[PDB]
Amino acid sequence: AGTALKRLMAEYKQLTLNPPEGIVAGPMNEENFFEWEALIMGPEDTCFEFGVFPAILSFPLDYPLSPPKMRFTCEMFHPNIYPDGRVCISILHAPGDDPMGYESSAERWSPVQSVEKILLSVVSMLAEPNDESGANVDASKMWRDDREQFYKIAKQIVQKSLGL
């Protein structure tokens, strides 16, 4: 097995052994460890509380040297999530001379990170709509100019994810 396969099996074992609260993640099929499905719950007492949000994680051949791609498959409305579902946060951006508008030498991906860490960071991102990427310009603007409406939309996003 290549380095990538080794690391990914190792990470998954730790996840199955000690399941993280509010986060479920693993390969859709163990014949291909490079494609995972993840489910994360919006943290209690935040505007996305109890939403259940599915995402696909696609890992590069050179993992963990490069980060996975992560895309939500459900409807979302958040400053750091593109209209297509792609999650844009500094920790998922490969170190490189192209800020892609993140931050002052924003914290990039490193092999120190892990799937558990990416997912916990995304959970935090939901709880703390931290406009670092302006991925959804409309959500960015509303978070800034009409917070109370943003909260309204967020509960709708929750209800939709629950199928209610």
Binding site: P19, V24, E30, M41, E49, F50, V52, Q159, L162, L164
Partner: peptide, 28 residues
């Protein structure tokens, strides 16, 4: 565990996550 065991547990954790979230949302 086997892969089959792991895959089944995963599907189960996912169903249960959604069921408990729904309960907490409706309970609130």
């Amino acid at each position: 565990w086997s892969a089959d065991e792991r895959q089944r547990m995963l599907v189960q954790r996912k169903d249960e996550l959604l069921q408990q979230a729904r309960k907490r949302f409706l309970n609130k």
